[PDB]
Amino acid sequence: MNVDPHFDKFMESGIRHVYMLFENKSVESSEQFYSFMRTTYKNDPCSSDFECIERGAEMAQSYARIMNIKLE
């Protein structure tokens, strides 16, 4: 696709390191998560491959605790 390579790094890292452990995946849980990852990114974008892979991980990780989401 023609995607922001940085958001797509940041988003894919969020999904593979956190979101795929979610025990309860559904339509609106993915959209809340996407809406948070998108707004977070857009207010303070990461600037590089290495910076994105790891801000995506630890922010998805934060999201998990904020809205208190069951993992493993």
């Binding site: 696709m1 995607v3 797509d8 988003m11 999904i15 593979r16 979101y19 795929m20 309860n24 995946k25 559904s26 339509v27 609106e28 849980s29 993915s30 959209e31 996407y34």
Partner: protein
């Protein structure tokens, strides 16, 4: 939202399911638009494979690196014995002997999901009838949005 796409995803999967005489048939649909991070089942026919039976069939993450995704972007159909990229589970599903699928593209000409047929028995009609059943439904979902 405007549904309407799902009214048409139902009608076409009906035709696809019965014409292919598959055991289980589903319309998968990507989200968000043009980024394809998640895949949902928005309509199925037949009996669900044991791996997705009493489980949410929506919001499953898209692995863009599996064959089916890349093959659909080249514009050909995909079939397989043991690779179900989009089926909403991590567990394998060895009770599936065969899967055949074709992409559909929306009104903006973008990969928007798949129409997919599954067999539990190892017999199935020819791939050539599978193609034309598939392509004629793909064309209709594409116009529907």
């Amino acid at each position: 939202r405007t549904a309407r796409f799902e009214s048409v995803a139902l009608e076409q999967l009906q035709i696809v399911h019965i014409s292919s005489e598959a055991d289980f048939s589903a319309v998968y649909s990507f989200r968000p638009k043009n980024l394809n991070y998640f895949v949902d089942i928005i309509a199925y026919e037949g009996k669900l494979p044991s791996t997705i039976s009493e489980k949410s069939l929506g919001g499953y993450p898209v692995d863009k690196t599996m064959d089916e995704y890349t093959v659909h972007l080249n514009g050909r159909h995909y079939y397989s014995n043991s690779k179900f990229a989009f089926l909403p589970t991590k567990k394998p599903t060895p009770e599936i002997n065969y899967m055949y699928s074709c992409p559909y593209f929306n009104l903006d000409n973008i990969y928007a999901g798949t129409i997919t047929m599954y067999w539990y028995r190892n017999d199935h009609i020819s791939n050539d009838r599978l193609e034309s059943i598939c392509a004629q439904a793909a064309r209709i979902l594409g116009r529907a949005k």
